[PDB]
Each structure stands twice: as C-alpha cells, then as structure tokens.
Design a protein around this ligand. Structure first.
Ligand SMILES: CC(=O)Nc1cccc(Oc2cc([C@@H]3CCCNC3)nc(-c3ccncc3)n2)c1
Length: 277
C-alpha cells in the first residue's frame, strides 16, 4: 500500500505535510480558537485558473472550493483565502482529532465491510454534493479523505486537480494515474461522472483489500479484478460494476447507493463508537 492581513487573524502551528498540493500547516483562528489548516500554493505551480462571480483571477481550486463550501457537507470547507506576491493562501476547516484514510488503512489493514460500507456511503454523499454544486473532484482516493475520529465523519480534501462539471468530454487530467480509468489511459478522453465512478471502485477495493487493485497501465486496461482478501460476493459485484471497462456499463450514483451491499449503513456516530473509539 504505497502513496501516489493573514499573519494577524491566524496563529500558525506545525507543518502537516507538503507535495503537489503545496504546504499545509496546522493553525488556529485567533478570534475563536477554531482549528484550521493553512494551505500555501505557489503561483508558478498553478496550471488552472478561474474567476469568482465578482470576477477576480484565482486558482480553480478556490473557485471549486467556494462552489462546494456552502452549507454542511462531507467536503472540507474554505473559510478564507489570501493572495501574496508569489502564492495563494487557503484557510480550511480542520477537524480534531483527524486521520487521512490512507494512514488509517496503513494502521488497520483491510477494513471490515461494515466500516467500509459506512465510509464508502459518506464518500458517495460527498461526491454527489460536489456534482450537485457543479464540481468534479477528479482525484478521489484514500489520501484525499479525512476521518473525524470523534464523529465518524469523512471529509473530501484537495480540489487542486478538479474542474467544473460539464457533459462534454474531458481531454486533460492531472489526478492520480492508478485511480484513472481505462478510457483515459487508452484515449486521453473521459466523461466526468463515469470517471468518478471508476475512481470510487478503486477506492472501495482499497478499503476492503487494504491496497489498490491496479499498479500498471496494462492492468487498468485489462480491468480484471483479483481479490487478495476475503470479500463478500455482494461487495465484489459492486466493485466489478464500478470497474466496468466500458464507461456506460458503470453504475450511476443512484445505482451504487441502491446496490444490496450498500443497504443498512451505520450512522457516522455509531461508526465511531463501534470502529474508531
Ligand atoms: C491538502 C489539503 O487540503 N489538506 C487539508 C485540509 C484540511 C485539513 C487538513 O488537516 C490535516 C491534514 C493532514 C494531512 C495533510 C497532507 C495530506 N494528508 C493529510 N493531517 C492532519 C493531522 C493533524 C494532526 N494529527 C494527525 C493528522 N490534519 C489537511
């Protein structure tokens, strides 16, 4: 299982990590001690720009976060942003305590199906929210999911590879290759929802098997799934449906949520009491 006036209103804490997303720090909003994450993105590493209603030039990541950050959801909310000479600074919600799903799987190995069902359900609700707001994440994977360990609530992070949702073909991609569908590998072409569903099949396999099913382009294109762990027939059926080679053979979000494997989900709080506390 491998990886693939600002200084006034916030007290900066430790660096949490850095990589293609930039540098993320632990912070606290001085006005009310709200835990926050403070994300720095270098201007010359932004390939994707957009504009807000009022029409200032910002990272697409900021456009997409604002579109999804209205109301409650399983998406980490953008509280504020700042422009500096050579960077943007994003202020994000930070649950406490928290663990990314990749780290959680490193520690626990393959998840019990009840727990994978609860997590997968919450991810589907979060992704529906994004699509309903006109946003395609395009990098759904365990590294981009945070677990609120007290509340059993999952949160989607890192909209740095995302785009506005459209009904026409995408011919650009900068998300994670091993979660990218066969139509991307073979043709550099995909549609948003069906590519999202493929990534969800990779994620669900990852949860119940403790690693992703495919490492190489050849395995993605062949689309034969081998189960390395004991997984129920119903769970294998859903995974193999999400991982249909032809995009139009993949389930819709409604078909995933109506699948027999997805019935009788735990509530997040019961999830945390049984599995996390
Ligand atoms: C990219 C983005 O938007 N990040 C984000 C957004 C909001 C909150 C956030 O808070 C985090 C993130 C992580 C890492 C950060 C790097 C990616 N992987 C998860 N770890 C912990 C943590 C703190 C203290 N103890 C354990 C764990 N908190 C990170």
């Amino acid at each position: 299982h491998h990886h693939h006036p600002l200084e006034s209103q916030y007290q900066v804490g430790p660096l949490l990590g850095s990589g293609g997303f930039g540098s993320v720090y632990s912070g606290i909003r001085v006005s009310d001690n709200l835990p926050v994450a403070i994300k720095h993105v270098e201007k010359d590493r932004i390939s994707d720009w957009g504009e807000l209603p009022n029409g200032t030039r910002v990272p697409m990541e900021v456009v997409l976060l604002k579109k999804v950050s209205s109301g409650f959801s399983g998406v980490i909310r953008l509280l504020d942003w700042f422009e500096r000479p050579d960077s943007f600074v994003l202020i994000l919600e930070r649950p406490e305590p928290v663990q990314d799903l990749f780290d959680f799987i490193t520690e626990r190995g393959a998840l019990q199906e009840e727990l994978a069902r609860s997590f997968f359900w919450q991810v589907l609700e979060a992704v529906r929210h994004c699509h309903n707001c006109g946003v395609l994440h395009r990098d759904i994977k365990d590294e981009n999911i945070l677990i609120d360990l007290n509340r059993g609530e999952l949160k989607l992070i890192d909209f740095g590879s995302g785009a506005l949702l459209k009904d026409t073909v995408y011919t650009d991609f900068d998300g994670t290759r091993v979660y990218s569908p066969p139509e991307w590998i073979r043709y550099h072409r995909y549609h948003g929802r069906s590519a999202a569903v493929w990534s969800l099949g990779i994620l669900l396999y990852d949860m119940v098997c403790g690693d992703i099913p495919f490492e190489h382009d050849e395995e993605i294109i062949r689309g034969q799934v081998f189960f390395r762990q004991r997984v129920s027939s119903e769970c294998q059926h859903l995974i193999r449906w999400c991982l249909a080679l032809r995009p139009s053979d993949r389930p819709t979000f409604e078909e995933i949520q109506n699948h027999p494997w997805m019935q009788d989900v735990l509530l997040p709080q019961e999830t945390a009491e049984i599995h996390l506390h």
